[model samples]
Target: YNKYTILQVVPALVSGGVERGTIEVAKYLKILGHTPIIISVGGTLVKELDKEDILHIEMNSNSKNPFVILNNAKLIAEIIKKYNVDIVHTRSRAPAWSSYLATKWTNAKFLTTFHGVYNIPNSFKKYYNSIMLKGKKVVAVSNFVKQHLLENYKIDEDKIVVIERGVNCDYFDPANLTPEKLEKCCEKYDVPSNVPIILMPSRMTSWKGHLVLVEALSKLKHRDFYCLMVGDISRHPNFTNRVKELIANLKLQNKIQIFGNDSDIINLYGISDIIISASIEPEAFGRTIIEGQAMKKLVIATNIGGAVETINNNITGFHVEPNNAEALAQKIDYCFSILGTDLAKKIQEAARHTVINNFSLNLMLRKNLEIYKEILKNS
Candidate 1:
């Protein structure tokens, strides 16, 4: 049978790329007339599933405690049998262990999305991380993550699938925003309509390059751009404070706005002349880059990891040297000069076209569902 009751195991239903993708996949499966169930310690995003009439089994599936893990395995196995789940798709390491054992007790096939190139500081840690590989098919969000798996782990190339994450370009498109909507959005953020709006929407993590962004801002000769940095001040107050201190020290506080926890980014993206991804570390897939392009905004990203795949230097977007403030500043200057030119329009037009063709949500879903169908067809 082509139908499969997919039981996706996630850490929690919090706000993240992985969590949102899990919900998208499960809900899409239900829409395709296949059963989809999610198992996790529920959080804010659980309402997204319930609204779609999908099943969410709340459990400590991601418990790091060994005893809790063992109990979760038994409970997951029981759920698999009772609900008749055909595939156990896990996205995290801790819950992956429980799902791995649970599948052995039931007829469900194991699948996983290796979301990141996790740090395995020692051999013991590497061994534990190997649990993600014990799947019928491992989804690598980008070719970078795929290479990381092959080099770091002892797995056959055939077992891994490079399924690049995507965005809803139709929704992210700027043409959808009315003049009235844009004005209201600008008023809501208190961003001036006179200056060019530059946005970097990311959590306040050291590796996300907030410090690097401020340093880059200090070097910019163009003083007219209003940069906005959105982050999680509620959760990462320490890192957020350090970032604010750096911005203050740079004397660029007047030019930039730092805030946290906003539900609306499309409006922010709507008003932004440029979108930036200044991550110092390799992103599995820079969701920021794709969405920026989908919104048809000028994008400048670090030249590493999935950014390499999503961005074409000086064409669709610019890719600067990672962690290099001077290089980032140079590109920002370039965008400033071209902002009113045909060249800027060309890049913005091509940006949306690029994502719609290669990185659409439908493409991602089709690739992932094909993996599910393959697993369901297996013995």
Candidate 2:
């Protein structure tokens, strides 16, 4: 492939799957002898981009104001002309509108990756969300998202491609965990080695179903397990406190622990026996399910959206009804019963194999590069 300047535009460089995807693609593009430029309202991730030598142009792409978006379009157009950008890839709606307008002004090819099921309760909102579907080649992070676009938008089915999000399987590999790392992670979290560790690594949001997990854990007959609610608690202190209060009321404070965001997530995964994703709302792509599977741990996710695609029911992991605490409790009990059995080993092997064969980082990167090549070739 010939060297081409690929510019990725997002609202901000904040922590999310979209930001992580931008960084991953930027890194791979540089390794492949292509220039990757990121245009966004800078955040903590800009330092990591700088370390990778990825050029990050700070822009107020986060503003949803009409005047700001128009100004951003002109600014992006200037960048395209100055940098000789070959393709303009956008990941979110606000910046996508600017990028779309800029691509129309310049000769740069336009592309978009549909990362989530954006809320569109009315026609105006629907049209606003339509900016994501305006790409010459729209990429969906999951089949669920692809179908969502097909059903809601007037885009051609052939224009959409499903490129499911990938996990860094190598980093998540249990074999990579050192004794010191595991010990430190255990010591830090006060994780007990003897009890089954049920990990739910998600933002402390109500929709993420922390309450559902708490209720489910309360219902579990097997009280020998410890459920870790791990994520940024500060983002939603009210919800965190409510969860804490709920645990206290149920007299399960000793069973459930809410740890704020941990940097050493891989080590936590290394020590976890079961991973849970109890999101009440439909996730466009539940990334934690695959990340846990990559670690060779049996995962249980609500039976909706991308969870169905990422997990093989009764094979890699089990799927419980969304918002159904009783179902989640039953699955937890089932997992506990098979903890050290041959069935559990088989499930773990399947989970790792599923991730390795389908959701590996290398596969995601290679497919994305191929899409870039195809778009550039046609452009």
Candidate 3:
């Protein structure tokens, strides 16, 4: 194999799916004997790049201003030529514009991953979002995202590849976690040993369906279960308080607890009895659904977007109608009733097998590498 230098551009090395995927791809690039460089406005995850011996160049690629974007394009072109970058991969829209121009100015192959179904309420926004579709090979994170592109943009179907985001099964596996680790996780979260735990792990956002989940839990026949709305709440205290007020109004304050973002998410998955992805709108790709399934937890998600593809609907996990709290509650009731039954065991086995066979981290990395190789060969 030839050693190729790949430079990935994002707005920032912040906590998000795009940032984590960039890091994982960079690590795999190194293992394949290629140089992986990253350009972004640095964040806490920058230390992770340092640990992997990956080079990171901080730039104001996060700016959306016209002049700043043009300046960023010039800067990126210079870096590409200086480092002999073979591929310019971009994940977000702001940096993508700059990277697109840079790759056009240089010999580097341009690529982009459509990470979300960006809201385009008008023509100007649609034009701005078109940069993501300008790649030589565009990556859609899910079939839902691919369909979105096919319907919205005039891009060739042959140019877009559906590469669903993958979970690190090694770290997320139940067998890998020790008893002490599980015990510590329970202690940290104040989880009771006997009560069934229903976990909703996502950022504190309205679209995630936190309020819907709370409403659903209130309608459940069983009041013995504990519901944990675990996510980053610091950025949205007003929303968080609003959710808390709703919980109080529903008289579920004691049963449902709102925990801020925790580092031990894998361990949390290990202890959860049921995991939920109750997004009101369509998710581009539901990472938590796959992660929960990998942990052998009974996952329930909204019947929309990537969840339709990731879940087998009662075979691997269950699906509820979007924005329907009554449907969600009924599913939760059924799941609770069936826990530890022969069918539940079978579903658990299938869930983990589904992740291992289809959504493993190694598979994602290998597929991405193959795409890069093909693009370079053609170029």
Candidate 4:
């Protein structure tokens, strides 16, 4: 009968999967008439929280310094006591440590999500107490991450739960897009009109396989496709330049366009013919893969890692062998050939079906709600 207050602590409301995940969960909690608050070092995404009318408290949650971590714990303890927070959830190591400390000072239960590879510093190893795994229930973003924990960490299997990230189908659906939005996107990105648009939406990072995609693009026999590589270019200026040079070297300069910080991604998906996630490294879970699928676009990702889980391999979407430029190029060529075929449409429909049936925002919301209620019952 009471609105449960779940306070989430993160490094920032900045750009990253963890940051966005925190916001998505908080937004869902609010829609269910619960109180959800966020604590982070301030950033642009704080604007999103503001729009939701969600409370955001500024904290140095990103610091790994021992002194700063303890200070943040005191700050969090005060907030937990002041707000009577029922659950103190965190999404980062530093914040997890602080939240764990705060939970001890209050009646609040502590929970944290395991994002990816984590290593404890030797000095802090003694006191860290497997903090990320010590939660009431450690949430793994995907089964891939869960398996990593099971294989690498000495932890009880029952303590971990896999809750894959979900896309907002309503917002991402092609049916929901307006002509105005599509036109605006085409104009803003200067999207080439006469060719199939290939969109790579991940931030400029090496392991994300920007190089692999560039290599694949060079090998593609299909010369008519327009490739758009868009994300946070500032994060890797040198790597971005290398990718640009490679495109130019491969005589792909005219075919490929690299842009930075375009928030109009949903609309971009609407105008694109195919979506690409050419990561050489394993994504804990591919959020953009499902996002592209929700848009019902032809998605091509690596055969390894989280892509294997989301993509049904030439079914919902096409998958190429990881780090193999030739396979990626061949897959892209195949998709370009079938771009408008009935078979392609069937695959696209199935992609949308997988997301609607399994990976949805509502489903993610309800699962977390159940987790929250169950944890509180024991508390």
User: Where does model 2 exceed 4 Å of error?
Assistant: 13-16, 62-67, 119-135
* Model 3 lDDT per residue over 1-379, tens place: 5889999987653323888899999999998889999997887768999998899998865455879878889999999999999999988843366788888888988888888776444564445446544546788889898887777654578888888889999988899888998899888878887888999998898888999999899997355888888999987788999999999998888788999887879888888889999998888888899999999989999998886678998899998899999999999989999988999999999999999999999899989999988888954
Give one clash count per candidate, in the order shown: 0, 0, 0, 0
Residue pairs in candidate 4 whose N, alpha carbon or C atoms collide under 3 angstroms: none
**Better-scoring candidate (lDDT), 2 or 4:** 2
- Largest TM-score belongs to which candidate? 2
Error of 4 at 133 (Å): 5.7
* Model 1: lDDT of residue 213: 84
Better of 3 and 4 by TM-score: 3
Instruction: Count backbone overlaps in model 1.
Output: 0
Give TM-scores for every candidate, taking all chains together and pairing residue i with residue i: 0.92, 0.93, 0.92, 0.91
For residue 212, what is the lDDT in candidate 3?
Answer: 91
lDDT of 4 by residue, 91-198 (tens): 874336677888987899987677775655556543343653464577777887778666655446787878877888888888878999898899988787788999
lDDT per residue as tens, model 2, 234-331: 87798899999999999898889899897879988988899999988888888899999999998999998887688889999899999999899899
- For model 1, how does the per-residue alpha-carbon lDDT over 1-379 read when each residue is reduced to its tens digit? 6677889888753323888788778878978889888887887767887888788888865355878878889999999999898889888843366788899778988887877776444564445445545556788889988888777664568988988988977678777888988888888777876788899988877888888888888888457878988767766788888888887877777788788766877888988998989988888888989999999889999988887688877899998889999999888988888997999999999999999999998899889899887887745
Record all residue pairs in model 2 with backbone atoms less than 3 Å apart, i.e. clashing. none
The per-model lDDT (C-alpha) reads 0.82, 0.85, 0.85, 0.82
By the TM-score metric, which is better: model 1 or model 4?
Answer: 1
Sorted by TM-score, highest first, which candidate order results? Answer: 2, 3, 1, 4
Q: What is the Cα-based lDDT of residue 123 in candidate 1?
A: 62
Roughly what TM-score does model 3 have, to 2 decimal places? 0.92
